[PDB]
Amino acid sequence: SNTQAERSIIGMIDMFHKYTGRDGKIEKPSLLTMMKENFPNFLSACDKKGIHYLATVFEKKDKNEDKKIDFSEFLSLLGDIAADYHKQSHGAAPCS
Amino acid sequence: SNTQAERSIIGMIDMFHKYTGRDGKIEKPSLLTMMKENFPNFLSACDKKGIHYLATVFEKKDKNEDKKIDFSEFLSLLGDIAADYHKQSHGAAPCS
Ligand SMILES: [Ca+2]
Ligand SMILES: [Ca+2]
Ligand SMILES: [Cl-]
Ligand SMILES: [Cl-]
Ligand SMILES: [Zn+2]
Ligand SMILES: [Zn+2]
Ligand SMILES: [Zn+2]
Ligand SMILES: [Zn+2]
């Protein structure tokens, strides 16, 4: 009944919920597990480029500095990953 | 080799590319076809709420007013759809 694009959006909300606490936001250790579980090939390409994405991702995406990642900040992180994959689709090297 | 989350991101880039012109941006008639093809259940829920999402989506998401939707603006639209589905996941009515 749902399209592939709709199930994809629903899958990202289901993913977010695997990592949220009772406040519906993601703490730092949880974010890093989410990245390692769901974006391992993304992370691996950075580490080759000499980049430890995990060292800064929490602090960079915690825009309101409340030491949580909320849904809006989580979407911003997915956007970032999407931008990298789009660049790759055009012959760019991973994690630039 | 790619995770489900990675294939989902790749699927959204593949979707974007179904609708772009030679300049790598999406014109209005194309955006509306993309919505109707990929988010029909989203759109249907709006039309019930008396909302014609298609009447304004192009103009609302064309942030730089160049009459194209570029990748960054397309991600912003997916974010919007994601926000609605997240709200739904918490008992909110579709298209609020
Ligand atoms: Ca925050
Ligand atoms: Ca534009
Ligand atoms: Cl939540
Ligand atoms: Cl493009
Ligand atoms: Zn939630
Ligand atoms: Zn696992
Ligand atoms: Zn492209
Ligand atoms: Zn079709």
Author numbering:
A (entry chain A), B (entry chain A): 1 to 96
Text from the published report:
Hallmarks of the S100 protein family include their small size (~ 100 aa) and the presence of a canonical (calmodulin-like) EF-hand motif and a non-canonical (S100-specific) EF-hand motif. Intriguingly, however, S100A7 and S100A15 serve distinct roles in inflammatory skin disease; S100A7 signals through the receptor for advanced glycation products (RAGE) in a zinc-dependent manner, while S100A15 signals through a yet unidentified G-protein coupled receptor in a zinc-independent manner.
Similar to S100A7, S100A15 eluted as a stable dimer from a size exclusion column (SEC) indicating that the seven divergent residues (R21GD24GD27ET83AT51IN52H and D56T – S100A7 residues are shown in italics and S100A15 residues are underlined) did not disrupt the multimeric structure. S100A15 crystallized as a monomer in the asymmetric unit of the monoclinic cell with the dimer generated by crystallographic symmetry. During the initial refinement stages of the S100A15 structure an 8 sigma difference electron density peak was observed that overlaid with the bound zinc in S100A7. Thus, it was apparent that substitution of Gly24 in S100A15 for the zinc ligand Asp24 (S100A7) did not abrogate zinc binding. To complete the distorted tetrahedral geometry of the bound zinc in S100A15, a chloride ion was modeled, which refined to a distance of 2.1 Å from the zinc and a B factor of 25.4 Å2. A second zinc atom was observed in the S100A15 structure (at Glu36), which was not observed in the S100A7D24G mutant. We expect this is an artifact as S100A15 WT was crystallized in high concentrations (50 mM) of zinc while S100A7D24G was crystallized in the absence of zinc.
